[PDB]
């Protein structure tokens, strides 16, 4: 019931501009879990599924099958933004240990944390 | 070309709730390899209405940096901009200015 | 200017009010609550309204409440304890209740003097 680290949440992006993603689609919260108890507002990574194969460093693939997803999809830590709760609506999933570590690793990538 | 640190004014808006909204000068997080390629920007905003930090996520920048007024890093408040949506190039941060950007930003995503 | 009201010894189980009453600035753009300092300790946050929050030892017991006619906040102290006994300080804030929770920093805008609250 509370929104924690690694939840994926179904979330309306929209609208955007240019190369933004855009859409109602799937998320991934990346804020951490004190900053998810007492703010307003989570931080969350985009996925899509117009790819399913990760082109850059910064993307992080998921099986549709164990996240309950339409189809393999790829986590965008270069699209990666704050959401006010109020804009999260079905959970859908969290990730697994694993995945989240891929995730904490192509976000220091992301952000040029080394 | 945009690096990784520069300070661009920015058209945030629109946006919902909480978000920190408005044109504003916001600073670019996103690495300098995916400032090179990509077609967005991953950004920080700054805001005025305060000048000390609230919370760890929180870094607060001094006329050195051409802001109107004292203003603070929102580093909870991230998000990936078209690259259109930058206007003027207003500065770019110190190299311990963008030290303790990347010590709130490790904080502020869970990544210690 | 903050000045806060109410004060004062009570019994354990029983209530008090706390006032702060907000002279000057802005009633609709600041975040009002209160902290407590028991003797050698850190300012803890007790309660904010800007939306309401309440540290948990306090929480269930204790009801902020504001009143914009009258500039003032109040603070239901109810079922009172000993631990409850603090110098209790109002406190405002540009940016809202996050300030007043263990993630805060402390760094209040607005401050008042404190009131004594003992109870035994």
């Known amino acids: 019931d509370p929104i924690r680290r690694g939840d994926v949440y179904l979330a309306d992006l929209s609208p955007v501009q240019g190369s933004e993603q855009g859409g109602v689609r799937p998320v991934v919260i990346i804020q951490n879990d004190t900053g998810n108890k007492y703010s307003p507002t989570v931080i969350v990574a985009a996925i899509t599924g117009r790819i399913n194969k990760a082109k850059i460093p910064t993307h992080v693939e998921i099986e549709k099958k164990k996240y309950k997803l339409d189809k393999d999809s790829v986590i965008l830590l270069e699209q990666i933004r704050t959401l006010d709760k109020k804009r999260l609506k079905e959970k859908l999933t969290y990730l697994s240990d694993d995945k989240m570590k891929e995730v904490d690793n192509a976000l220091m990538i992301s952000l040029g944390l080394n | 070309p945009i690096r990784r640190g520069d300070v661009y004014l920015a058209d945030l808006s629109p946006v919902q709730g909480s978000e920190q909204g408005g044109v504003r000068p916001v600073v670019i997080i996103q690495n300098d390899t995916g400032n090179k390629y990509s077609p967005t920007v991953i950004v920080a905003a700054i805001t005025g209405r305060i000048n000390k930090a609230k919370i760890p996520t929180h870094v607060e920048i001094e006329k050195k940096y051409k802001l109107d007024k004292d203003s603070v890093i929102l580093l909870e408040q991230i998000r990936t901009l078209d690259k259109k949506r930058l206007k003027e190039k207003l500065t770019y941060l110190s190299d311990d200015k963008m030290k303790e950007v990347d010590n709130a930003l490790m904080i502020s995503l869970g990544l210690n | 200017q903050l000045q806060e009201s109410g004060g004062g010894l009570v019994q354990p189980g029983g209530s008090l009010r706390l006032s702060c009453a907000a002279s000057?600035?802005?009633?609709?753009?600041?975040?009002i609550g209160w902290f407590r300092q028991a003797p050698g300790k850190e300012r803890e946050g007790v309660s904010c309204?800007?939306?309401?929050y309440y540290a948990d030892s306090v929480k269930g017991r204790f009801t902020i409440s504001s009143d914009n006619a009258k500039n003032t906040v109040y603070l239901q102290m109810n079922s009172l304890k000993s631990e409850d006994t603090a110098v209790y300080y109002c406190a405002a804030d540009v940016w809202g209740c996050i300030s007043y929770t263990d993630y805060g920093l402390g760094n209040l805008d607005y401050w008042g003097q404190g009131t004594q609250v003992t109870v035994s």
């Open positions: 000057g600035f802005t009633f609709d753009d600041y975040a």
């Open positions: 309204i800007s939306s309401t």
